[PDB]
Structures are given as C-alpha cells and as structure tokens.
C-alpha cells in the first residue's frame, strides 16, 4: 500500500491518510534559535530496569524490536511527560545515503539515521487505545551519527539476516533498550504525530540533543533489508524516512 518509494512515498500519503496535513505532524526541523526554555520541565526519566525484549521483526517499512509491556517493566516518566508510559518497541529510520536518513533535523541538519523508542500511556489500558489520545503516546528519538562502530547497535544489525524479507521474525531476547541511549540526556520536545501511517497526532515527541555513533560500515547493513515479502520481486529498503513537517503553530521546548 503506502511506502517510501516514488509512487507511494511520503508525498502521496495525504491521499489515503488525509490527516497527514494536520497541525501537529512529525518530523520537523528544530530551529535551535527558537527553542523556548521551560522551568516546568524535569530531567528525562528512563526507567528501563526490567526492560524485557522479546523479538526483532521486519514489518514492511523498518524492523521493530518488540518488548514485553504486560506491566511497567520499562517505563518512561519525568521529562515533559505527565504520567507513566511503557516501552512497547523500537525501530529505526535510515536513508539511501550517509548524508541523509534521520527524520527530525537540527537547523536543517540531517543525521545518518534515527532511533525511535515508542511508549504508550498506561492510563489508556492498551497501546491501541493509547494511540488514539492527544497524550497516549511518547516517542523518544535518538540520532545515529556516522563515526565509530556501535557495539550496542551491532548486536542488532548482527541478526538482521534473520529477517531479510517482510513478515520474518527472530527471537531477539534480553536487550537493554539502554545500550542505545546517549550519555547526556538533554532534550527538545513538542506535540507531534507518528511519522508513518496512520500518522495519528498523539505522540508527545522527545528528541535527544546528543547523538549515538554508527560506523559508515554499519548503517550500510540497515539498507540490506527488503520492503517486500519473500517470493515477491526483491525490493530493497534503502530509504525509509519522512521529511520535516510544518511546525505550523506549536513550539519546541527544551531541557536547557
């Protein structure tokens, strides 16, 4: 159906998903000289103590690393959030080149790729209901910037071979969602939406200022997965990021 190609890419989305033209859409370009500071913001609380990964998985536009959310095993609180969100899964966004690839941009600056940790608000019963409310979601974005190899990441890319085509799934067990976070957790934040169909406007985005490193050699494996399912004509997942959206009204707060 929809995809990051040419005839079904991010542009023709507003066709089947008219909400792609809402007022709180993501990603966006964060204008560092527009970030307004806010004394109501607290440090990001990343309680990934009992985070329990269950299985990596190729879904058709990226690969997700599903986590158990039966209870508050890995939770996100503090920060700009107002509640407790459970980590449900994380996936990546990369581009055909090393010059581009991240969804969000700092002063129109692009990074090699972007990691997204999706969490839903525990006050909405389940992730499904959760993603229907203006606050039911909290997504943590991490910039992957070219440089040195990422021992943490490699333990991921390392298994991609097990999910080359769509639908495929391997048991990715025991994995610190933390191995992936940067060390200094300053952050920007604003009201947005999912950067992919259904594009629901409910994510309360949190992007991390400092990025994590990735070798030019590594992000190279990302674009080895296939969009299509086994049997169908081989289709490479070379690029899968959405362009910066109109910040329209909104405004980007920051923890600094």
């Amino acid at each position, epitope marked *: 159906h929809w995809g990051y190609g040419k005839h079904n890419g991010p542009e023709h989305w507003h066709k089947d998903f008219p909400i792609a033209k809402g007022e709180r859409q993501s990603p966006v370009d964060i204008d560092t000289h527009t970030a307004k500071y806010d004394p109501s913001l607290k*440090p*990001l*609380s*990343v*309680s*990934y*103590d009992q*985070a329990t990964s269950l299985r990596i998985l190729n879904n058709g536009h990226a690969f997700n690393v599903e986590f158990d959310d039966s209870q508050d095993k890995a939770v996100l609180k*503090g920060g700009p959030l107002d509640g407790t969100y459970r980590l449900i899964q994380f996936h990546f966004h990369w581009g055909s080149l090393d010059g581009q690839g991240s969804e969000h941009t700092v002063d129109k600056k692009k990074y090699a790729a972007e990691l997204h940790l999706v969490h839903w608000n525990t006050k909405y019963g389940d992730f499904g209901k959760a993603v229907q409310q203006p606050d039911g979601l909290a997504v943590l974005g991490i910039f992957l910037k070219v440089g040195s190899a990422k021992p*943490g990441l490699q333990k991921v890319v390392d298994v991609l071979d097990s999910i080359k085509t769509k639908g495929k799934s391997a048991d990715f067990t025991n994995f*610190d*969602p*933390r*191995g992936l*976070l940067p*060390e*200094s*957790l300053d952050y920007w934040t604003y009201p947005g939406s999912l950067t992919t169909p259904p594009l629901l406007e409910c994510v309360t985005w949190i992007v991390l200022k400092e990025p994590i490193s990735v070798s030019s050699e590594q992000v190279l494996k990302f674009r080895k997965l296939n969009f299509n399912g086994e049997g169908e004509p081989e289709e490479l997942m070379v690029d899968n990021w959405r362009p910066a959206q109109p910040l329209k009204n909104r405004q980007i707060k920051a923890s600094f």
Partner: nanobody
Amino acid sequence: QVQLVESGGGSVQAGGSLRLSCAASGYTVSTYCMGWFRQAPGKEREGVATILGGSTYYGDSVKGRFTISQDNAKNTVYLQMNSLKPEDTAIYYCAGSTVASTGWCSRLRPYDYHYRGQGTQVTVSS
C-alpha cells in the same frame, strides 16, 4: 531538590584505606544508576565505579581494590577504598543519573550523570 552530599574524605598513607559516603535527598539511590568519578589535578575526569542495585562496575584501575555499595535503607551509596596508592590522591565525586540500566550503567561515566555532588578531597601520602 536533589542534594547529593559526600563525606569521609581525608589524608591517608599508601597501603591505607578510608570509606567515602554519599547521602541523597529528594532522590532514591536505588531506583536509578549511580557512581563515582574523580578529578585529579592535571589529569582529566576519570570514572571510578558505578552501581545499579546488584550490578556494580569498576574502573580498570580501581578494579579489585575499590568497592561501591548502597544502603537504600538510609539512601547512601558508599565507596570503600582499599590499599590506596598515591596516584589515587584526588577529588572524588558522587553522581546519580536518571537512567535505570545496567548496560547504560556499565559505560562508567558518572561525570555525565545529571545530579552531581561537590566531591571530597582524598590525599594519599607516601
């Protein structure tokens, strides 16, 4: 607000040993991952040890003769230093981040942890 007080520093002779302590306020030394790092003069910030409950990690040097622990019953992460070397002479700081992760904690970089203390002078005579 989160106050982080250290104590127990001082001067001791090589081969000696003393125990630094860190008391938290408006913070719970057990929920998140904490640690110590030291700022020796002339040298740059060095990570000593970190802890997140059962998992404790030690800097390649102090490893084996230093020990970190917590007494959450009184919110205090202690740092037991044993058989000190003169090289150890420096200011030791107490840090306490907001990340609950063994992996993130094994990085051993308390000098990047959000909540910091004032440190305590620890001099080792020969």
